[PDB]
Design a protein around this ligand. Sequence first.
Ligand SMILES: CCCC[C@H](NC(=O)c1[nH]c2c(c1C)C(=O)CC(C)(C)C2)C(=O)NCc1ccc(CN(C)C)cc1
Ligand SMILES: CCCC[C@H](NC(=O)c1[nH]c2c(c1C)C(=O)CC(C)(C)C2)C(=O)NCc1ccc(CN(C)C)cc1
Ligand SMILES: Nc1ncnc2c1ncn2[C@@H]1O[C@H](C[C@@H](N)CC[C@H](N)C(=O)O)[C@@H](O)[C@H]1O
Ligand SMILES: Nc1ncnc2c1ncn2[C@@H]1O[C@H](C[C@@H](N)CC[C@H](N)C(=O)O)[C@@H](O)[C@H]1O
Ligand SMILES: [Zn+2]
Ligand SMILES: [Zn+2]
Ligand SMILES: [Zn+2]
Ligand SMILES: [Zn+2]
Ligand SMILES: [Zn+2]
Ligand SMILES: [Zn+2]
Ligand SMILES: [Zn+2]
Ligand SMILES: [Zn+2]
Lengths: 273, 265
Amino acid sequence: EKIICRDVARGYENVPIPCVNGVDGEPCPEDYKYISENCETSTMNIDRNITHLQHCTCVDDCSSSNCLCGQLSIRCWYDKDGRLLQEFNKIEPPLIFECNQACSCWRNCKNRVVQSGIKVRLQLYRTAKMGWGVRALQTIPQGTFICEYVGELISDAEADVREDDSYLFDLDNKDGEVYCIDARYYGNISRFINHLCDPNIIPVRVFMLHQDLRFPRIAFFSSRDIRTGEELGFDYGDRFWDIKSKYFTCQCGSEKCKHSAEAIALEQSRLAR
Amino acid sequence: CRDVARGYENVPIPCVNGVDGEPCPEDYKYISENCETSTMNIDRNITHLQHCTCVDDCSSSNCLCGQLSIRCWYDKDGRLLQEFNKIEPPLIFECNQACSCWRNCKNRVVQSGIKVRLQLYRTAKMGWGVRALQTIPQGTFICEYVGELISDAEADVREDDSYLFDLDNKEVYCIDARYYGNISRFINHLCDPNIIPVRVFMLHQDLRFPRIAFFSSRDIRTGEELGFDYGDRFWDIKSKYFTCQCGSEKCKHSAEAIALEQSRL
Ligand SMILES: CCCC[C@H](NC(=O)c1[nH]c2c(c1C)C(=O)CC(C)(C)C2)C(=O)NCc1ccc(CN(C)C)cc1
Ligand SMILES: CCCC[C@H](NC(=O)c1[nH]c2c(c1C)C(=O)CC(C)(C)C2)C(=O)NCc1ccc(CN(C)C)cc1
Ligand SMILES: Nc1ncnc2c1ncn2[C@@H]1O[C@H](C[C@@H](N)CC[C@H](N)C(=O)O)[C@@H](O)[C@H]1O
Ligand SMILES: Nc1ncnc2c1ncn2[C@@H]1O[C@H](C[C@@H](N)CC[C@H](N)C(=O)O)[C@@H](O)[C@H]1O
Ligand SMILES: [Zn+2]
Ligand SMILES: [Zn+2]
Ligand SMILES: [Zn+2]
Ligand SMILES: [Zn+2]
Ligand SMILES: [Zn+2]
Ligand SMILES: [Zn+2]
Ligand SMILES: [Zn+2]
Ligand SMILES: [Zn+2]
């Protein structure tokens, strides 16, 4: 086992993200460009108009019920330490509207967690069965911001012709025109987070410096206390596995695994009779 | 006010008034980065970024971004080299998200933000101004001219040009700090200036949209008012409404200076 890179983010995050390999001879991944914030190749025509921001008139730290930005998700879901409240809906999370440059409040108000970046210590590591993965190097309480799903913002039409969908994330569940983040060519640490059938982080859609609802940003928060050494993972979703399961099956090893060869076979044999 | 920037800069920018009873200004919105109010089609395509292949601190002459800048003009402490053309500054291309270097390389001064202590204050004759609260060595990055990116056509429609900065394209775009701006909107004209504007590219390289960075052109002492040369064009427009009050012996735009040149004719 060897530390093969001290910081895959090259200093772009608040904290380093080392890479270790104790499984094989694979060097730290080079077949992508690490970026800390979303990029575009062809333009997405994002509405950046500062006058199109809903914003608040608070002169405190935006902890009162009078903060419009909080009201845009019924309430601000962050406590004084930046963690999601206990009663936050982790099954169907609301859209979060953080404070922004139009708000009268200060940059250090309580409604600005995701825009402040990575704070926890993570490690890129070689897994036994799933390629690279990401694990915690510290205790992470439930409700803590982990990292953003960062990559190249692309259209539905462009996503459809991309050869590799292994790093592709669509931004809404609906049937219409849905934009995507493709982390294949450009991405951050999130591109390495694997699927777990017993996940410990959840994606939350967030708005910060724009409120172009076509382009929510994807923030991962812990859904339970996470222990040092624990692999991070979220539920990729059934749609992902419907596509992929003819190529590989889930190796998460959970007793609750929904997408292993065994689980899939038990499903099909249920119908084979 | 302890900080007109509301915590958005690396350091506070306090405001004081020891001249009259005017409250610190509130007839604008402080923003720390440029904004837009109608679509500005800036080319942000990451594949269009020229970028370097350095793994050093980008002080090497092999750094492409340095070469794009003619050379990297930053010394080890982030200050412009003496050889920098302060009369007609070049374009600076800082490193960006496409470069292979680390975020702490030597070619990222402007994108790292304000480091010096400044103060918004009431001047005797020129309204509000900005002054240093520390010694500032020559070549030091001070602040960016931040405001609302607008087209020249939009600029022509607007009533007030007192906070309008022409990016000098030859289609034309401007930064209007009238409604949205940062501390730079308060920096006055001086005929004996101590800072200079420099065109800089950082996260995009759309040459239609340079960002404007101010650097000190000489050592500045604590308490000294900051100022740059607004340019003859500004004064050709404005001299019919007011004249220069900078009070320098080399003042070019005072009523007296103007009258002398006119009577000469
Ligand atoms: C590799 C990233 C995880 C796996 C990933 N998951 C999600 O996109 C997703 N979207 C939402 C979630 C997740 C997990 C949520 O949980 C909720 C959400 C509202 C954020 C909406 C996926 O399924 N990738 C295949 C793929 C994506 C997109 C296309 C392009 N078009 C055909 C749609 C093709 C293939
Ligand atoms: C209040 C800001 C200082 C004064 C200001 N100075 C500059 O714009 C300027 N531009 C460059 C400089 C300066 C000082 C430089 O030094 C060099 C540069 C290449 C950065 C190009 C000005 O002249 N404002 C009147 C004004 C601007 C724009 C319009 C709209 N269109 C007719 C263009 C009308 C009136
Ligand atoms: N639960 C899983 N079981 C098997 N393979 C997985 C699982 N989760 C992620 N993967 C693999 O990881 C890919 C998704 C990537 N976004 C994650 C990083 C990937 N492990 C890598 O090494 O680059 C999938 O297409 C699979 O190849
Ligand atoms: N040298 C000067 N002489 C007279 N007035 C000046 C001078 N420099 C700047 N000004 C004034 O300041 C305006 C430019 C502003 N960007 C500077 C801040 C301005 N002093 C204010 O109080 O808002 C000009 O239109 C003038 O009203
Ligand atoms: Zn608020
Ligand atoms: Zn706020
Ligand atoms: Zn707000
Ligand atoms: Zn599983
Ligand atoms: Zn370089
Ligand atoms: Zn560099
Ligand atoms: Zn570079
Ligand atoms: Zn003068």
